[PDB]
């Protein structure tokens, strides 16, 4: 199973 | 609920054949050499372990516990194993023939069991070999591998699926796969099975973050469609698709990038498929791109504006291909302030035989603001200089007596004076220290007549005259129509302020008095009355912040040329939490206003002809601590028929949540019977809890699911 | 009568010199707020100034949403409602922050056979919403001075 969340700058 | 969940979770403190040893260990007996009995209890930063027998190495902090049970510390999980192990300096907690759940003690709603389970605390994952997933005592599912994310770190793999039953597609199933591409970009690929169509739509989402801004793309594709292939048997194939792109951002504080793009395979797409971006409520898909440069005194923007129109009733649509907008500003030019607006645009049509044009517009403005404590006066002057070259005129000039001209110049001086006062009064009638404010405005506007009937209308819709609208310098939204003006707008606002100087209430009333007919030369307007001068337009507005939880709004527009209230709206809201609210709202738009402002066939087609008289009620409320009920109802009072109804129930627990949503909406018209068509949808969502930071009660998501979605009016 | 002309300025005497801060200093809310502050006779210092005694207004998140507010009897949009929300804060030297917000509602009828014209009408409306947001933020400054004085008392 996966987990989605917010994007952020590396 | 988050407190009721953490009440079931252990919390972490800041030596010794033998018992209490320090990580901490306790037992009835310990043999020390490594250590080896009875009432073995172990506790640390992230776990409790308990069992009959244990072992540990004091140099490596390696550990074994047999036949034991465990709990997580400061995090919700628990379970048992036949052999429980700690490895890799407490990175790994490993479970032979083990089990796991996020459920609180003794409340076994669901668990995972496996031949081996590894919790890894650096990677935020539980990995399971020969996984069996159980609800109560019953194994629902099995796989050779499983992984659960036991934290907040993003991970590739399948998400929990969801289902619905719709009158449009029958049974529907969604199985999302999520791809963690990078910190700043990701994808989701979701097969969407539909039972009536007998084939899977592939829904592809891509998201990104960049120096140029953030954006989302969606591509939904269905290779063939057994429903559409029976209604449209003439085409090459029954392919159904949607492409969507949204982008927004400002780069280096000066470069502005925006995209707002939708394209669909056919007019029917959003009536068939309930979708994340479009709606069955929409008559076209918008297709826009823009690039801007902006600084403190200047900006320039290049854009294209294209629209895909779904209705067969007229197939002509205009595009801007491209448009260029330019603004320059210069303050303190002696006593004056200055601005220049410039525009250049090319207009293109979807039909081969409609007119096409290039337009250039230039608009230098000079103004003189003068201001006191109690009032201000502002004077503006402009030129409205515009040039057209028009092309492809043969077809239009063959059908019409008034003819389009290949070249047009329009030059107009605009003059405006805008004057405002403020008066204050002490109140004793409401409460001590309350203050009333009273604010009259008057504006005079002059624009001379120019006959514009040799210019085709590519971009100018008639604007709507709300209370702020009373003070515009324009009757139309574009530059193809600019009406003459010779008018005084007058209006008054009153405000009430409390003893803490917060605005509790306001009301505004005003009117436009016309000294001469406001004309374009291509007016053609189907009003109820031949009235052309005097106090023709009225508008009013009010807001009461009755308390920190109660709020009331209302607006009214009356037009003497319609002999009726043109449009009106009001709403009252109580809101206490995100989860507790009640809103009543009403919207009105008269049959006369539809006849005046919209396409000529709306006055004749029964689905448009009667205007709007819509009552809406919306509520959200928690029942006990663990149920959320959400609902909305909308009613056409002229039809005595429902517009929209929604009902969402979520049961929310520490271990899981379940949501059931219902919607029944208007979704088209039957031309063979002259009645509305309705779609029903029942949706089922299920969610594991206590594994990640989410304890939300689901209300605000349900409140925006329907075709007439909630807006907070406090 | 009982009424009189307004004595005090719309902006507090303690805020007539202030710093304006934004993550988007060249944007349409920043331009509306510059214009509304300057029309009230405020002088605005740069974010990098040597001054430490002056208050500062920071412009935070702006959101705009466009929703179907009414439908025709076939379920198509009659009216869109647009809502603009602005969060901002006023920071007073030696004292706490005072968060403030503006909220604006406008609505318009849709027209599919004049879609380009309706998109230009929407750009026209959103430009006016930024001016009403800037007015609402200014009309809240007297409440911040009242809360500042109350905190000192």
Numbering used by the authors:
A (entry chain C): 20 to 29
B (entry chain A): 27 to 38, 40 to 41, 53 to 54, 68 to 69, 73 to 76, 80 to 90, 103 to 105, 107 to 784
C (entry chain B): 19 to 171
What does the paper behind this entry write?
Furthermore, we solved the structures of LptDE bound to either LptM, LptY, or both proteins (holo-complex) at resolutions of 2.47, 2.62, and 2.63 Å, respectively. In these complexes, binding of LptM, LptY, or both stabilized the β-taco domain, enabling its structural determination. The structurally resolved portion of LptM forms extensive contacts with the internal surface of the LptD β-barrel, particularly with residues located at the periplasmic-facing side of β1-β4, as well as with the β-taco/β-barrel hinge region preceding β1. This interaction between LptD and LptM remains largely unchanged in the absence of LptY. In both LptDEM and LptDEMY structures, we resolved portions of the LptM lipid tails in positions proximal to the external surface of the LptD lateral gate. Notably, one of the acyl tails intercalates between the outward-facing side chains of β1 and β26. Similarly, the holo-complex and the LptDEM complex showed an RMSD lower than 0.1 Å for the membrane-embedded portion of the translocon and an RMSD ranging from 0.1 to 0.8 Å for the β-taco domain. Henceforth we will name these distinct LptD conformations “contracted” state, as observed in the structure of LptDEY, and “extended” state, as observed in LptDEMY and LptDEM structures. Our comparison revealed that the pairing pattern of β1-β26 in the extended conformation (LptDEM and LptDEMY) superimposes well with that observed in the LptD structures of K. pneumoniae and S. flexneri.
